[PDB]
A paper describes a structure:
Among them, we have the proteases encoded by the 3C region of the enteroviruses genome (3CPro, hereafter), such as [name] (CVB3), EV-D68, EV-A71 and Coxsackievirus A16. The fact that all these virally encoded proteases from coronaviruses and enteroviruses perform essential functions in the viral replication cycle by cleaving both viral and host targets, as well as the fact that there is no known human protease with a specificity for Gln at the cleavage site of the substrate, has pushed the scientific community towards the development of a commercially viable antiviral drug targeting both of these virus families. While this dimerization is essential for the catalytic activity of 3CLPro, the enteroviral 3Cpro functions as a monomer. The structure of CVB3-3Cpro adopts a chymotrypsin protein fold.
The crystal structure of CVB3 3CPro in complex with the GC-376 [name] precursor was solved at 1.9 Å resolution, which provided atomic details of the CVB3 3CPro–ligand interactions. The N-terminus starts with an α-helix of residues 1–14 and is followed by two topologically equivalent β-barrels comprising residues 15–77 and 100–173, which pack together to form a narrow groove for substrate binding. The catalytic triad of Cys147, His40 and Glu71 is located in the cleft between the two β-barrels. The most relevant feature is the binding mode of the ligand to the catalytic Cys147, which occurs via a covalent bond between C5 and the sulfur atom of Cys147. From a crystallographic point of view, this is supported by the fact that the bond length spontaneously refines to values around 1.8 Å, which is coherent with a C-S covalent bond. The protein atoms involved in direct hydrogen bond interactions with the ligand are, namely, the backbone oxygen of Thr142, one of the imidazole nitrogen atoms of His161, the backbone oxygen of Val162, the backbone nitrogen atom of Gly164 and the backbone nitrogen atom of Cys147. The only exception is the conformation of the phenyl ring of the benzyloxycarbonyl group, which is basically flipped by 90°. This effect is due to a different structural arrangement of the C-terminal segment of CVB3 3CPro with respect to that of SARS-CoV-2 3CLPro, which makes the substrate cavity of CVB3 3CPro more open. The larger available volume allows the phenyl ring to rotate in a position that is structurally more congested in the structure of SARS-CoV-2 3CLPro. Specifically, the GC-376 [name] showed 32 ± 3% inhibition at 100 μM, and the GC-376 [name] precursor showed an IC50 of 4.6 μM (pIC50 = 5.28 ± 0.07).
Residue numbers in the entry: 1 to 180
Amino acid sequence: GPAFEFAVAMMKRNSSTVKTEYGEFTMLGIYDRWAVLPRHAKPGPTILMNDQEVGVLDAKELVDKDGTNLELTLLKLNRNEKFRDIRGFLAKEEVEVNEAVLAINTSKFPNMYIPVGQVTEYGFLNLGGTPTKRMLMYNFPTRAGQCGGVLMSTGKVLGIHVGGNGHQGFSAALLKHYFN
Ligand SMILES: *[C@H](CC(=O)OC)[C@@H](C[C@@H]1CCNC1=O)NC(=O)[C@H](CC(C)C)NC(=O)OCc1ccccc1
């Protein structure tokens, strides 16, 4: 319940629907002009954001100290409107909760919310043939078209959905030090 009400408030304020040449994604703005997409969104020099073309000033494919994939891409957008600073909702390490929701905002899933239930720190995962770390896991049959969805519990933004088998979901932890 409370995690659901928090998600709807957060997605109305900070989320948008983004199209790259590789698909449609939920995008979460973090602070200033910095937002986060799953790495496989592979944004080019311009993206489509709320159906309007937006130039990309920089894109950082996040990787740990040994070069291990984190399945996160940080982009600075060439636009004047600043994002509401939600870095205080970002934890310093991988968050576990008992009740979380996954929130999605694309043409295929418009403002759709999801009772993932328990979220635990998974860690390493061979994700699509790519060794990846800092994964968060939930037991929900997550679908395609859902990557970029924002994993949240009440008062917390846990990470970004990046993959899943048939009956499991996996999020890349959205950590505070990623954005200074
Ligand atoms: C991203 C789909 C999307 O939004 O594309 C526009 C999701 C969906 C998955 C697949 C079904 N359940 C989901 O939620 N992620 C993927 O498709 C990823 C892509 C990688 C490049 C990150 N692949 C994936 O989930 O592979 C399945 C898997 C294999 C091994 C271990 C875990 C999952």
